[PDB]
Every structure is written in C-alpha cells, then in structure tokens.
C-alpha cells in the first residue's frame with residue numbers, strides 16, 4: 064500500500080464538482096508524473112485488494128492518499144483523454160477497421176482480466192466510453208472498475224449513463240458479469256458510428272425505451288454483418304444469451320481472420336454521409352413517439 068502525500072501533489076482540474084468520487088488531474092511532484100486522483104469518503108478494507116490488479120488495458124494504481132479526513136486513490140493519467148471525447152471529435156476521422164479491432168480487443172481483454180484473471184472477480188457495472196481512456200500510445204485503459212463495490216459516490220444526475228446500462232442494471236436487479244457485455248456492445252457501436260448514443264434523448268426516456276420496449280441503438284443497414292451480429296448478441300434482453308468476454312475475444316479473433324471484413328467495414332465507415340440519416344430517422348421517431 065504505497066502512500067502518496069498531499070504535500071506531494073498539485074491539483075489543476077476537477078471532474079465532478081469536488082464531490083466524493085470526483086477525479087482530479089494532478090501532478091505527483093516527487094515523481095514528476097502526471098496523475099489522476101479520485102476523492103473518496105473513506106478507504107474500505109475490502110477494496111484494498113483492488114490495489115493489486117494490474118493489466119495493460121486497466122488504469123494502473125499508483126497509491127492512496129491518507130490524510131484524514133481526506134482520502135484518495137492515485138492512478139496513471141492517460142495522455143490522450145477519454146474514448147468518449149475522442150469519438151465525438153474530428154480526431155476520430157482516422158478510425159478504420161484496424162483501429163476499431165485493436166480498440167475493441169483492448170476493452171475486451173481488459174474486461175476479461177477483470178472478470179476472470181485478477182485475484183478477485185470484478186464486475187464493472189458502469190462500463191462506458193467516458194470510463195475508457197487513451198494512453199499516449201493508443202492503448203485503451205478501463206477506469207472506475209472498482210466503484211460498483213467501493214466508491215458508491217462515483218456511481219452517484221445520471222442521464223449520461225442510461226444509454227450504456229443493461230436492462231437489469233437500469234432495474235437495479237441482481238447482476239451477472241454479462242451486464243458489462245451489454246455496456247461493451249454500446250462502446251463498440253460508438254466506435255463504429257462515431258455517434259453519441261441516443262443523442263438528443265433524455266436519460267430517463269432512454270431507460271424506459273431500453274427496459275420496456277426492448278429498444279436498442281440503430282445499426283445502419285450497411286454496417287458489416289459481423290459487427291451487427293456481435294452487437295445484437297451483446298444487447299440481448301436476456302443476460303444469459305450474452306457472450307462472455309472470452310467469447311468476444313474469440314469472435315474478434317475470427318473477424319480479424321476474415322479477409323473480406325476490412326473492405327466491407329472500411330467502405331461502411333467512409334459512407335457515413337449516407338447511413339447517418341438512418342440514425343437520425345430513428346431518433347426522430349423516438350422523440351415523436353414521446354410527443
């Protein structure tokens with residue numbers, strides 16, 4: 064349990080309003096390192112075992128702040144920001160089939176480690192594109208994987224979470240690991256369409272569309288079948304019909320050994336000026352149904 068001192072830190076920026084669960088961009092002075100700092104109410108003994116998880120697709124624990132009553136967890140800071148901000152910018156014009164497959168695989172391998180390879184089983188329950196960050200070399204790193212057990216303040220408005228939540232999560236029902244599979248499917252759709260999920264709709268309308276009407280994100284017709292099949296499998300209302308992350312990794316492996324997919328996918332990606340209306344027409348229908 065390496066301890067980082069308050070006096071060894073300079074804070075530059077905060078996400079979440081300084082509340083418990085807020086995350087700071089900061090500088091670890093003695094290490095001359097940029098770091099992220101999450102404020103916690105308290106360090107619970109159970110979550111100390113999170114300090115030993117380590118994987119290249121998971122954000123790396125650096126240490127804890129214990130200066131009572133102030134408590135915090137310090138991690139690496141991924142230089143290129145959140146996946147969500149990258150996707151909804153002009154920076155993501157460069158995404159192609161190979162880019163999507165590498166990043167899909169990054170998140171799958173991170174989640175597989177969390178579910179099956181760490182000293183404890185970890186079910187994220189809040190996986191989303193704001194919770195994946197991009198390291199300097201483009202490696203994706205999952206954040207906030209321990210909040211569902213520990214920091215119940217990073218969990219909790221919640222509007223910007225409902226599009227990523229499995230139906231059983233929205234219903235506060237008991238949860239298996241495939242709730243993360245559902246969230247992953249949404250992240251995959253964001254990489255394929257470069258669209259904000261359910262853009263324009265309020266979170267609670269999304270919650271009702273997803274749980275009651277079995278609504279899902281629109282998959283454009285020209286999206287290659289391999290991606291549509293994986294997405295539909297991840298979005299099954301029945302949690303047990305969803306694939307494990309080992310299965311997703313296997314499926315991504317098959318897809319990358321399909322020599323026809325790169326042409327199919329890359330033609331789909333630079334044809335957004337055509338299928339974008341399909342997304343916009345569903346969004347019209349959903350808010351018209353609301354009215």
Ligand SMILES: *CCC(=O)NCCCOc1n[nH]c2ncc(-c3cn(-c4c(F)ccc(NS(=O)(=O)c5cccc(-c6ccccc6)c5)c4F)nn3)cc12
Pocket residue numbers: 077078079086099100101106110111112113114122123124127136137138139140141142143144145196197205206207208209210213
């Ligand atoms: C609001 C403005 C906004 O949107 N900002 C986001 C844009 C930029 O954000 C980032 N860009 N690069 C980043 N790199 C990392 C983060 C980041 C790091 N965390 C984070 C922490 F700093 C601390 C703790 C956690 N929780 S955890 O579940 O992941 C965890 C991990 C390891 C160990 C432990 C542990 C718990 C208890 C006892 C010991 C250890 C917990 C966390 F996610 N958050 N964001 C952001 C950006």
